[PDB]
Amino acid sequence: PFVKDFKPQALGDTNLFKPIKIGNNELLHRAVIPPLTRMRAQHPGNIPNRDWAVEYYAQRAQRPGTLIITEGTFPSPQSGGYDNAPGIWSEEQIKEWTKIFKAIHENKSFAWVQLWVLGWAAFPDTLARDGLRYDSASDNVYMNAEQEEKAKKANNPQHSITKDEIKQYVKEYVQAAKNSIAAGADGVEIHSANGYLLNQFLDPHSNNRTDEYGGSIENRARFTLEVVDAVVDAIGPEKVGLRLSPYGVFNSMSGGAETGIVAQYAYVLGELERRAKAGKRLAFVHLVEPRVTNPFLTEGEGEYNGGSNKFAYSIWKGPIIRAGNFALHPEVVREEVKDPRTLIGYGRFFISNPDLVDRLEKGLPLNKYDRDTFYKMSAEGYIDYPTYEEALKLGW
Numbered sequence: 001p002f003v004k005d006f007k008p009q010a011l012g013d014t015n016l017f018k019p020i021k022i023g024n025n026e027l028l029h030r031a032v033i034p035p036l037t038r039m040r041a042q043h044p045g046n047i048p049n050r051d052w053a054v055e056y057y058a059q060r061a062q063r064p065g066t067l068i069i070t071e072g073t074f075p076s077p078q079s080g081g082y083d084n085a086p087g088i089w090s091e092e093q094i095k096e097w098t099k100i101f102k103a104i105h106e107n108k109s110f111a112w113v114q115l116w117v118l119g120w121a122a123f124p125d126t127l128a129r130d131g132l133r134y135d136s137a138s139d140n141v142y143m144n145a146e147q148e149e150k151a152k153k154a155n156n157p158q159h160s161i162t163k164d165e166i167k168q169y170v171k172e173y174v175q176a177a178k179n180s181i182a183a184g185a186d187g188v189e190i191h192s193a194n195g196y197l198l199n200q201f202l203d204p205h206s207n208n209r210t211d212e213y214g215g216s217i218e219n220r221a222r223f224t225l226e227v228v229d230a231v232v233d234a235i236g237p238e239k240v241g242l243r244l245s246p247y248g249v250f251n252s253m254s255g256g257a258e259t260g261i262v263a264q265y266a267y268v269l270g271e272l273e274r275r276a277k278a279g280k281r282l283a284f285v286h287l288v289e290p291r292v293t294n295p296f297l298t299e300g301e302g303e304y305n306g307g308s309n310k311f312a313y314s315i316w317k318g319p320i321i322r323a324g325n326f327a328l329h330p331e332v333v334r335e336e337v338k339d340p341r342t343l344i345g346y347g348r349f350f351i352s353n354p355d356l357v358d359r360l361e362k363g364l365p366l367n368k369y370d371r372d373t374f375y376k377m378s379a380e381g382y383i384d385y386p387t388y389e390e391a392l393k394l395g396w
């Protein structure tokens with residue numbers, strides 16, 4: 001149905017509908033589709049859906065000039081450990097991705113591939129089946145009790161990756177980024193957020209290393225920056241973004257409870273801005289807001305109000321995409337887009353509204369999302385969500 005308790009507000013008069021250049025692409029609007037894992041990829045081979053996926057992304061590219069960041073996508077088998085999430089290392093997978101970008105391109109929109117590495121959020125048993133390691137920053141601290149048990153009982157205990165394995169990960173990022181461009185993607189986003197491998201190095205709870213990859217702000221950041229640096233060198237700074245969740249606690253990150261957390265993220269942006277002034281500026285930085293610390297909780301819940309992402313604007317001088325509970329709060333978006341380098345990711349409501357942008361322009365009602373079909377091998381809750389035209393014909 002439509003959302004019942006929502007008072008919509010037309011946003012067409014704001015900067016949300018002013019064009020902006022991000023990297024090589026000329027966006028005609030600032031409503032961004034953030035990366036959204038959907039678990040329709042096919043097992044075996046982590047293959048993008050050959051029946052639904054082209055249609056999923058086409059539908060959501062229907063407004064011209066939309067930046068679309070794809071779901072998390074694995075650079076390598078060892079990066080993985082979810083059967084139904086996609087990859088970009090094989091010919092099989094690339095062939096399907098080529099078609100998905102083509103469809104986005106035809107709707108006059110853009111496609112950036114999110115390069116996803118799981119670390120300790122992977123399923124240790126799924127990885128053991130395929131004889132792969134269950135990796136993280138350290139081996140003496142675990143995501144949760146469930147995962148510790150799964151890992152021991154599959155004889156696949158958490159491994160603290162060596163320097164050579166870190167290099168290997170970096171090669172796989174580079175190759176995965178090249179593959180994305182060759183297949184026709186506009187750029188890539190490096191997932192350094194939401195408690196996945198790179199975030200596990202950034203955060204001091206998950207990272208108990210005393211080597212060059214832990215034990216200080218500089219060291220916790222070295223991996224995230226090694227990957228950014230090598231991907232930029234491979235494909236160019238204007239085809240590279242980076243996602244961070246400074247106040248995230250998903251997958252057992254510290255959030256605001258950790259007093260050094262702002263400093264950790266301020267250092268990373270600082271270093272991005274240092275590369276920028278020396279002549280290699282990332283296309284964007286993408287921040288998860290403290291408005292949403294866990295995206296599987298309803299809007300309003302898991303909200304940290306002890307901290308703000310405003311510090312980022314003092315440090316990083318380029319485009320900033322912000323995401324978390326903006327669909328139900330046009331009044332907040334109205335104030336954030338008064339800043340002329342601020343874009344807004346809308347996650348969950350872009351799952352349920354293929355024409356979300358039209359609805360934001362003219363203040364239309366929003367389609368309600370079905371949490372139970374977020375992660376499910378089904379057309380339903382995926383490509384059968386209606387446009388406002390089609391929704392009136394059904395009587396909502």
Ligand SMILES: Cc1cc2nc3c(=O)[nH]c(=O)nc-3n(C[C@H](O)[C@H](O)[C@H](O)COP(=O)(O)O)c2cc1C
Pocket residue numbers: 034035036037038071072114191193194243288292295296323324325326327345346347348349374375
């Ligand atoms: C089903 C689902 C899958 C998601 N998958 C990803 C993902 O793969 N990578 C990522 O960086 N964020 C992911 N997110 C987080 C969203 O990009 C976004 O930050 C979050 O939903 C908050 O924005 P929203 O409140 O507008 O939905 C996901 C969120 C949901 C609900």
